[PDB]
Amino acid sequence: TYLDNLSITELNSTPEILDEPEVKIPTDQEIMDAHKIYFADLNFNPSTG
Amino acid sequence: TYLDNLSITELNSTPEILDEPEVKIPTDQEIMDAHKIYFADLNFNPSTG
Structure with missing residues (x-):
């Protein structure tokens, strides 16, 4: 086999995750x-x- | 039925003047x-x- 024409293209924007409002509050129930x-x-x- | 002597008297002299009403007093030591x-x-x- 041999192939000739190749391509890479961009299509969409993936949703990337921003949920971090300093998630930790140090309770430490001991x-x-x-x-x-x-x-x-x-x-x-x-x-x- | 013949009793030639019988009587009643009054006996008003009351002998409440008595003995000693005081037994020997205890100490209660026990x-x-x-x-x-x-x-x-x-x-x-x-x-x-």
Whole structure:
């Protein structure tokens, strides 16, 4: 076999993906339980313990 | 049916003047833990526990 006429041409614009608004927000749900310090607020009632 | 002597009297002298109504007083030395019911008097301080 032999062939003679060859061509490469451009036709369309392919859709290329731009969806990145800094996609990460570092939650890291282990340290949500890292508070461990708390303060109580009471009110005394007389004639009671 | 013949009884030649019989009577009633008044007996108003009442002998409420009596003996000693006081038995020998106890000391209760064995279990004077008979009062384990108690109440505590306390106060409360604000801004702390």
